[PDB]
Amino acid sequence: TCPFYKKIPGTGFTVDAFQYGVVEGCTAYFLTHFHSDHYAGLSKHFTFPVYCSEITGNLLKNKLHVQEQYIHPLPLDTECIVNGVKVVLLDANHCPGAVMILFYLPNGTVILHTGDFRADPSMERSLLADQKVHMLYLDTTYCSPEYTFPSQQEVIRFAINTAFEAVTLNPHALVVCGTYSIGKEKVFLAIADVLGSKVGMSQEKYKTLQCLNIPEINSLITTDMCSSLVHLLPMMQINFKGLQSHLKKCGGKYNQILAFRPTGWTHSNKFTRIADVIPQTKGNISIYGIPYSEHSSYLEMKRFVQWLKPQKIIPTVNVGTWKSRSTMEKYFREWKLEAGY
Ligand code: NI
């Protein structure tokens, strides 16, 4: 049955709650973003109203084949009414079309659901600043002080300079970027832009990108692999074996590969700076691991919560074990004692 952390009290709404069949009492199902864990259970067979961003709607329509009559896309940064209740969608700074949702309940309580997010100081001057938020449903993916990472911009600058140098040294080198869902698109778009190339990819992946309201997209991506010097492949293929094999398939148009595996955190964030990063190499193929995160670091999450000053926090990630919940409660108390709410 549908957990309490996916229900919004005093409404018949739920959030990211598609895997439990019909939820008794639920008149509207919100979807924060198009990642499979969150959409799990949605298909052409779903027949209740789904509320979401425009981008998330395009993906539902085109990739999942949800019937149009059930898709209710809402604009960002706009006060809207849904079944008698005032809501607002905000940019979550996660993957394309991902939202936070603000619910203004009839009793005067205000609730923020972050979905998945990467907290940023620009969220401190949104519509959130205009009133007290009483309850917060929080993306707690990285809620522990060991989780540090560079900014998105530091990582992109590194990727840019690396790719430019390698291809000016060897103009018959190919650049590859691994991917498994939407998100982290700036990695490959910024590499392509500095090399004066379009990004080549499979038909399924091109169909996905075409839904994302990216401006001038037709000038940036193609399905013609041969015409392009940056290619996208599944993350699973980003290894020496998979990369040699792909290199054979391109018809001796390239004699070297430089590949990037964007990841979350792994243990080497705890010593290394982005500037110290060196690849793994076997022969004419080099692989770089780059920590491009679309979740809040511990410090970004803590700052956001200390600013917001919620009366109650409801975690949405790592809630499956008592040890994690207990650990998270401990950090919420510290934050509250330091900041005085
Ligand atoms: Ni996500």
From Swiss-Prot:
Expressed in brain, heart, kidney, liver, pancreas, placenta and skeletal muscle. Changing residue 139 to N: Impaired nuclear focus formation, reduced interaction with PIAS and increased sensitivity to cisplatin. Induction: During mitosis. The mRNA encoding this protein contains an internal ribosome entry site (IRES) in its 5'-UTR. This 5'-UTR generally suppresses translation while specifically promoting expression during mitosis, when cap-dependent translation may be impaired. It is found in: Nucleus. Belongs to the DNA repair metallo-beta-lactamase (DRMBL) family. Binds constitutively to TP53BP1. Binds CDC27, which is itself a component of the anaphase promoting complex (APC). Binds PIAS1. May be required for DNA interstrand cross-link repair. Also required for checkpoint mediated cell cycle arrest in early prophase in response to mitotic spindle poisons. Possesses beta-lactamase activity, catalyzing the hydrolysis of penicillin G and nitrocefin. Exhibits no activity towards other beta-lactam antibiotic classes including cephalosporins (cefotaxime) and carbapenems (imipenem). This is DNA cross-link repair 1A protein.
